[model samples]
Every structure is written in structure tokens, then in C-alpha cells.
Target: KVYNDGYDDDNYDYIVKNGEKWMDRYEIDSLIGKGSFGQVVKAYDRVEQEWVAIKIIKNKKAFLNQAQIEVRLLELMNKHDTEMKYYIVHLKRHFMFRNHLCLVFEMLSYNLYDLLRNTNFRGVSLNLTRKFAQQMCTALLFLATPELSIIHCDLKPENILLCNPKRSAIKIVDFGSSCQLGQRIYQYIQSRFYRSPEVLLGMPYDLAIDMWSLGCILVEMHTGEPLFSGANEVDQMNKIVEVLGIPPAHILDQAPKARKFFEKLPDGTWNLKKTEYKPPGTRKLHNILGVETGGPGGRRAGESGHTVADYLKFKDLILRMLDYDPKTRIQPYYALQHSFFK
Candidate 1:
């Protein structure tokens, strides 16, 4: 087969593997996803005998540099999760083509974004949420291990994909923005709604920040709306304050940026101004869950109703996940044993 050769506006070659192949193996199928960094293609792995997603990088020094780092981290983490027990996506391999970088990862079906969309934003059942919670925590446990200590950086629903179209299993993907603990710094990290308090306050952060986003994700999975859908960073904190109450005294004490969110009195106590109509705690989890038994959610396979007993355990775990102090935030190790799983 004759190969067409030309570069797009971004200097990316359109890979044409019709009746032939790129790298003499992968049968390029179709372009599945695209971004500022690159376009992702679905391809057939002749040697491995499977289908896969290949992330093709745009030809640029900066983008190429970032992708090299991404490939390194993915390759490293895949080795750590070689047993495939953790839910992190497996990066099969990477290669350079026409001076463009490409990453091949075991393909996943769809993201949680599409999952919610399939349900029309009705939200998933609590039991299904627990299953997701279990797998998510298991993955977090892997990243939290002493040797790994990875911070996902961005962990919103879109970055989480269902492994099989008809199955309940999931895999976390897109480590392009990830980093190892103590390795680097980032400003405006994580999505606004799922941002941890420390990150919002411009303080140094660590692994606990992922747990914070996990708590927010779980709540949103069971409830159609995000728990803290802030319009901005300032509005975001106010939304959190209205539900979880104000930050702890020590938290405010050490947070140099806390003044932007809280007002300090003459006596030096930090006070959070409420931007909502009601007082704090009034919008707490219990109230948001409603007094009625068997709260609403999109019906799922093998899903059970939300019992008061179940809600009790789920609420406790999320509260721990949302701990004001990152130091006090529940670690993935013990959180796996939380009664909600049982």
C-alpha cells in the first residue's frame, strides 16, 4: 500500500495504515480523541493480538518533552502494577514515528462523564458507587505506596474510564498531569469543584489531596450535582463552607492565603462569610441525602437501595476523606476496610 505523507497545521502527520501498517505492526483504525497535545488513535496490535488506544503527540519541543515524562511515569507505574491489581491504565509501550511520540495503552470503553450522561445526569446508585469506591481506593493504595507516592493532579470523572462497556469495573487514565510526591510544584492544580482546601489556600500539598477529590467524586456519582459547584475559587470555598462549615483554626492559622477566603477578627479568629441563603451544616450530607429512605439515583446492574445503615457508613468515610487537615485525611490503606465496602 502506498503511504500518504503530509503534516497538519501543528506539524503532525496523519497516520494512514490502510491495508498496511505503521511501525510494520499497529493497524491504525480511527482517530478517537484529540487535544492540544495530540490526537489519540484506535489501532490493532498485530503482535499482542488485541485492540489498543495510541496517543500520538504533536511535533513540538515542549509537548514532546511533557510526553516523554508521561511515558516514563506510565511505564514505571505499569511495572509497579504488573499484577494488574491496581485500576490504573496499562501503558503497553511507546515509540517514535516521523519525529512524533506515540503511546499505546490498553483501551478502555468510556469515561464516567459518558456514564452519567447515559443516565441523563440522574447519578449512579450507592451500591455501584461503592464498587467504584472500592476500585478507586485500591488504585489510590497503589499510588500511595512508599515507593510510588504519586499525585494524580487531575482526577475528575472524565479521566476515569469504565474498563468494559457492560461491566462495572473502572480504570483511571490520563497521567499527563501527574507527578511523584516531592518532585514538583503546580498552581491552579485539580479541577475547581474537586480542589482540596490546601491547594485552594496555596499551601503545599501531598497525596491526601487525591482523597479530597475522591470524596467529591463519590458524592457527585450518587448525587446528580457536584457537592461544591463553586463559580470561582472564592465562590468554591463559600460553597464548601456552607456544607462542611469553616476551616479549622490551625488550618487558617498556617494558611498564608487563607485571608483571601476568611475574615480575621480583632481577636484573631478566622470567620468564613456564608454566600448562601442558609447557614452552614444545614446543607450537610444528611440533608443533601434527604430524610426519605432509599435516595434517588440511576438504577444500575445488581444495585441495591441506599439504607440508613449504609448511608451512615458512606457518610462517615466521605467525612474522613474531606478532613480539613491533609494530615488527618483518611489514607487509602484503612479506608479500604471502611464498613461501606462490607
Candidate 2:
């Protein structure tokens, strides 16, 4: 209170340095990342004799409250998986330093998005993508279980980190916006690119939304580009419609924001309000993936010589993931068991 000692910066972010000691245990290494919430720093745990990542919450009330929820959710998830079977990032502990909340975690390698960046966004081999997919679904299957029932509101490449570059394993991080189902709070959730149609259409949402993000993520990860690159919400919905077509009458009838992007025609079907009206299902997922063109994904997809049946299974799983009806959307258990996994 007398002076900004630990948090002396204008943004109220802690001004730390390498080689500095904290809690007489963790030795500060360097700042690894920073976002709206706060910064994450790499540090060495002298007592444990290992490296770690510590998320330092901003000295702001709103961010602090939000981080508290993150701490709660992480702790709950950690307790349920003491053996660390689930791929969730393991949080070791938390404490307040200089009036700012600090969450200590086991340091992991770079994120999946960074992997795409390393390849110049030309994408990677399906073999590599499949390994990532299996681990992701395994974690999702764990999250969807009746015991935890956690909803990763923001599930994307950036939040998923590789535990070690050499090994093909990953850990899901950043639950800052996550919550338990039936206790949802945020009116808006998920990044725009990975956002589910139910959230975009103002329909009641659930754990299925995370599955939708996973579908979009898998496509982007394999294709070297976002499947639906939209400029705005209207554009996002239109992008989805171009591929999936109009929503069923039953679904459109209940969506609160339906009127914003669709019109009910005399024929009793919902019509997309886009200026360029393509007939339902005309966009075609195969063309975008270049699956028939020996796949524009990369030389790997073309050289590996996959079959038409393989792409069909891949597309079918994605379509289920993108099901307009969240109720019918692929559940984690079913998705993990999909033929694509085999």
C-alpha cells in the first residue's frame, strides 16, 4: 500500500526479473507470456528442483475474481485426477504475493498453434494430427464424464500445450473462462473462429459446445488454415451455412437470435440472410480440405495415399461435431469411439 513494490508497473502487472527469489522457493526465470488476465513467468522451484510456470494475476478486482474461479476449477479437476490421467494442465499450488494472485503450474512445452506456425501454416501430416486428436478426445471424454462435468469454454490450439516436443502428448491449459455445466455464467464464450453455432445463435448451450470447437480446431490443424474465416458474427454464421446449410426448422424455431441471421420463408424453412445465397450443403467440406486434389493439406497427405473411405470417416465425424442441433452433436464418448479414431 505504501508503494507499488511487487506490482510497480502502470498496468499493475508485477515487475519481476530473472534470478530473483520468491517465497524463498521459486526462483524467477523470465516472463513467458502475457494476456488480458495477466502474465505467466517461467521459474525454478528450488525445493522441488524443477522448472514451472506461474500465472500472475493482475492487481485488478475483476481479473482477480475471474482467476479465483480458474483456481477453483483447476483444483477441482486436479483432485479428481490425482494420477494425472486426464490431459488437463496440472496446477501445483497458489498464493498471493504483493497482493496479486499467483498460480503455480508444471511447465509444459509450446502450444499447438505454435506448431502450425513452425510449419509456416502449410499444416502437418495426418499421422501427427491423428495422434493429437486422440489425446484431445481422451481429455474431452474425461471432461464430459458425470464426475467432473467441466466445460472448457475456450478450447483452441493456443490453450492446448505439448507436454514435451519429443513425445506426442498434450495438456489443456487456460480455464480462465471455463465453468461447470448447469452453472454457466458468461453470456458470450469461446473465440470467434472456434465459437459454436448455438452460442452465435443465442441458443442455450452446454458441454457440446466444446466438441464443436474441437471439430473446427481439428480441421484448422490439418488444413493449415481456419475452415471458416469470418469477419464478423453474421459472416461466421454464413460461413457455417455455406458448408452445413440452413438449420432445421425445429432448431431455428427456438434460437433467440435466429432472426438476426435467418428468415422464415413461406415454404416453412429457414433461409440464410446472406447476400450471396448458396443452396443448402453446396459448400462441400472435401473441396476445402482438397481431399480429392490429393489434399492441399501438405505433401504428407498426398504422398501417404489415403483412401476415399478414410476422408469420408473424417468428414462424417467433423459433421457430427458441427451438428446444428447440439443435442445430436457428437458426445465425447461417441467421438472417441468414432471410426476416424480407428
Candidate 3:
């Protein structure tokens, strides 16, 4: 029962020796992944005789505190109801080892990022994308309900994992960055490519940010590439504007930091100020989604066979999720019933 004050990355092997008993039950097998605060290792649960994923937090107090919160949230979600737990990674148990906090969860297969890479980075089949989208929407909807509201600050391909290789069943992982609604500890969240505009502009945010990330992910799934892959913060904002068109003046007004990327004109309008890099022009969603764009009178001679009703429905969902005004953006529950999902 001795407390560990801290753990260094180099001491991983020494701390988690092979066959070493964890919590007097699970046996350490091998390292699976590592991050800033700790490592996730594969272990055998002696009692259950099953494989599990054990996340060992560094000994530092701050890291332990964060791990504690992540476990609490995961447990809270899992116990809420059966359906809610299905979409969330299950936290089986937690304990302290060698002064480090450790969390044991059901072992899951490759994450969505691995799935994308396995497909040679090309978009998956549209049907598969639709299936995954519905599950994700359902998961988000559960987390956004007032009684169960939680903000999964980080929502990206890497954090979405498959329950098994054969089935498309998936669950969300990595709750270290999550927070209860209105209880965010960090101002910044989400991976670079999946970050929402409100975060980039330093405006207050909520669950809608997850919707924005979902929009970017949906496009990536279809195009085999990120919807907005800016090299840095400035470039990222530019990339968003390039595709979504300049943020409307009203939306820009809410973000005081918008001045960094825009110019206030004498006509009381805001225009994208020239930057060190060339300004990016709008790249419509249909163009990025590779959908044939033609409607009514716009249909051309050879375009007769190129109808894109499916693509249009899909694009409509993306636009609503990515709307600049968070207030008007599609909520998770509402998005679950959008025509696109139907």
C-alpha cells in the first residue's frame, strides 16, 4: 500500500515486469500503447482468464488526478443504462500499482485510425461510413442528454475503437480529456484536424464541438483524407474558411480573436486579411466529397447519368454539423434523425 510519488518513462519495464501480478489478479503481458501521462498494456485477468487493456498512469499527482476523473466518468456512463454502455468502452476496474494509478478495460481491436490506414488511407465504402456515423451519432446523443450530459473534448479517429475485427461494432475510448457539461478543466481539446472553429477562435464551446469534429471525420472517411489539415492554428483556421467560406460577419463578431485572421473594413464588414500565405478560396462540400454537382437547369449534356441524391443527403448532414454558429448547428439527438441517417 505504499504510494508512488512519480514514474519516469524509461522505467516502464522495471515497473511492469512480465508476469507481475497487478491488483493481485491480472498478470502483465506486454505494452500496447504509450502517451504523455502513462502506458496502456495488455494483461491477462487471472480470475476471468481473459485479456484486458490496463492503462497505467504516471506517479505524478496531476496525472493520477486526471486518471481518477476519467475512471469516474467512464464508470458513471457505463452504469447509466445498458444502451449507453454499449457505445462506451467499459472500465472494468481500477487500482494502484507501484504508486501509479491503473485502469483495466475490456480489450478492443484496432481504432478507426488503424481502420483507415489498413484501407490504404482511402475512404471506406459509403455504406460502412453510414453505419459508423449512425453509431457515433447515437453515442454522442446519449452523452448530450441533460441528465447524462458530458463533453468528450477529444473526438477523433484514434479514439474510436472497434469491439472486434469482424464486426463494425465500435466504442469510444480515452476519457482523460472529457468533462461534465460546464466543468471543463482545459480550454483546449480535440486533435488538430478534428478541432472545431469555436476552439480555434477562442469562443466558448459546448457539445456542438463534438458535432463539428464528427463532420470533419465523416468527410475524411469519404475522401481518405482530413477535411481540414492545417499545419498550425492559423493555417487550420484558414483551411476551415477555405472550405466553409469566410465565417459570417455575425459569427466572427463573437470571437474577439477573429481580428487575427480578418480585417475590419470601412463598410462595417469583415474580410479575410491577407496573411503570409495566400488566402484560400471556398471549396464547396460537394466538391470535396467528390459528388457530381448538378441540379435542375445546371445539369449538363453528359451529366444526365450523374445524379447525386445520396451524396447530397450526406453533404447536407455535414453542413449542418459544421455550421459556424454553434447555436444553430445540429444537436446530437437531432442529428441522429436527420434525413441523411434515414
Candidate 4:
């Protein structure tokens, strides 16, 4: 059969002609979104007769590695399909064309980042954050175990999806930087602002790296602003220390990458602010229901009438996740069951 040299014209032209080959695949519509790997198009499944999102992984010089990473991770994720329903679901029948890997997934209208930025951090209530975090943790727990052993090198608000406005269900997407733990391969994954301290210090990593990203996501959702907008690697690590205090001696020794990074620095915790104590009214609160008031966030501060305490729990969680030592970082399973969710 002769192949068409140009793009498939009409919405469902390719699917209509090759439906048998692609397995009930058709086009409904298209929407535009962008990610680290490539562009995503909202498409209709002609054969299945449903609306779905297709992320087109462009195999360009810049995105070739990203495309490979996405495919590898998806294959790993597919192996544990039963454990995936609670997390990001990478639908099968997904195919890769030359210079393009088309992935069909559940339709997600918008991402948490769009919602947070549009509302100036409103609507992201404690309950909402908790629920989102709970599900994400569940996903992490499933991945962080020795068997699956996955690490989402990049986890942030932009990568978090909202299936519907009225519902709380979200899908974590964009696995261009995801990979299996161990084998210690690193080449600058994840957004710098959301990267783990260990990653910034050029250390080998594990599931703990995902935890650090999760911490960044938690606080970003709460504050509508990044917790660490570090200008560089040194600055980023310094910002982490400022918030979480320090990684402690034992943890640092355990962190192969972090210890090296810290050793090369000037040392002494790098606590530029000199926050030896917790400071007055600085403790974090976990309660998010009702019009609560207290601590630095104060009352009537952000949308939903949440207080600073509302952000504290997340703040501390990120700190724990950002622990310098991979050994001391909270495991995903344990974190999934933490009181933060309750």
C-alpha cells in the first residue's frame, strides 16, 4: 500500500482509512498543549467513539531523549497496569509514528498550574491539596517500592491535570523525565526551581527524588508561588536549607551527591538568615477545613480563607522530602499514609 507523504488531512481521514490497523482509532477534535517532550493534541477516538488527549512526542534532535524516556517509562508503567488506575493511566493501543509517538489518554481540560495561576492560588484548599497529594502519594507508593521502583524526576503543578472542574480527580502527565530507580543515570532532569537538593548537587538518586518534587508541588499549590526560585544550583540548595533548616550530619553522609556538594561549599548549614529556632508563630498547621486562622499565613490571607498554617504542613513535608540523605527521606508508602492526608 502506498503511504501518503503529507499530513493526514481532515480530522479523521487517517483513522477512517486505517482504522483496522490502528484498532478503532478515529479523530473527534483537537486541542493544543505543550510539554517538555512535545506537543499534545486533544483528539477524538473515531473507533472507540470517545474524546481523548493524544500527546504527540516529537522525535526531534532536542526531544529525542525525552521521547525515549517517555516510551521506556510507559512500558514500565504498563507492566504494572493494575496499580496504575489510582495514578496516571497510560492507555494502550498507543502507537509511534516516525518522529512522533502518539499517546492516547483520558481527557484533561486543564492542569493544576493553570487553575492556580488563574485564581491567584485560590480554589486550592487544604482539603483539595490533601486529596490531590493523597492520590499522588498513592501513585508514588506504588512506584517507590522495590519492585516497580519508579522515579518521576519531574513532578510539578504544570504536570498535574484536572479531569474536570467539578471533580477532584487529577492525572499526573508528562513522563518525559521519568525513569526507573537505580542505575544512577542523570542528565539534568526536572525544572530547576522544583528539583531536589540532591539532584541540584549532582548526586545519584532514587524514589526520594520524586518526593522532593512532590514537596515542591505541595507548597506551590498552597502558596501559588514557588518555594524555591533559586538562580542556580548553589542558590537552589541554599533556598532548600533556608526552609527545611539543614539535612543533618548523618543524612548528609548518606547522600553521596549531597555530601560532595555540601563539602565543596563554605559549610556550616548555610543558614544565611540564622534561624536557629523555629521562630515565633512559625510552626506549620495541617488543618484545612473551615475558615481557620493562625500563624504567619494569618486569617483571610489567601483565597478560601486559609491561614499560613495551611501551607505549613506542606512546607515541612517538602523539607522532609528534600532531605539531603536519600536514606532519611520519607518513603513513598509511609508518606502516602501520613496524617497530612487525614
Best by lDDT: 2
Model 4 agreement with the true structure over 92-186: per-residue lDDT tens digits: 55676643567777777688888888867644566677888888888787676576677777787888887787888887887777777768676
Query: Model 1: how far is 334 from its true place, Å?
Result: 1.0
- Per-residue lDDT over 122-156 for candidate 2, one digit per residue giving the tens place of the 0 to 100 score: 77766677778888888988888787899999998
- Rank list by lDDT: 2, 1, 3, 4
Selected candidate, larger lDDT, 1 vs 4: 1
Model 1: per-residue Cα lDDT over 1-342, one tens digit each: 233245444345445344547878898888887776788888999999999998988877888898888888888888787888899999988888877788999989989978888878778888789999999999899998888789998889888998899999999988888889984367689989999999899888999999999999998888766888888999988888877888888788888789888888999788875444356556777766542445643233233556677778888999999998999899998899898888
RMSD of 2: 1.9
Query: Which tens-of-lDDT digit does each residue in 1-342 have in candidate 3?
Result: 223333244533226667777667888888887786688999999898899999988877788898889988988888886554448888888887677778889999989888889877776766678888999998998888677688888999999999999998889999999888784356667888989988888788888999999999987876677888889888888888887878888877788678877887889788886664334555777776766744222322134333487768888899998999999999877888887766
Q: Name the TM-score of candidate 2.
A: 0.95
Off by over 4 Å in 4: 1-25, 59-69, 96-99, 249-319
Q: Give the residue spans of candidate 1 off by over 4 A.
A: 1-5, 11-20, 273-277, 291-293, 297-303
What is candidate 4's CA lDDT for residue 101? 63
**lDDT of model 1 at residue 99?**
70
Per-model TM-score versus the true fold: 0.92, 0.95, 0.89, 0.76
On TM-score, the stronger of 2 and 3 is 2
Task: Extract clashing residue pairs from model 1.
Answer: none
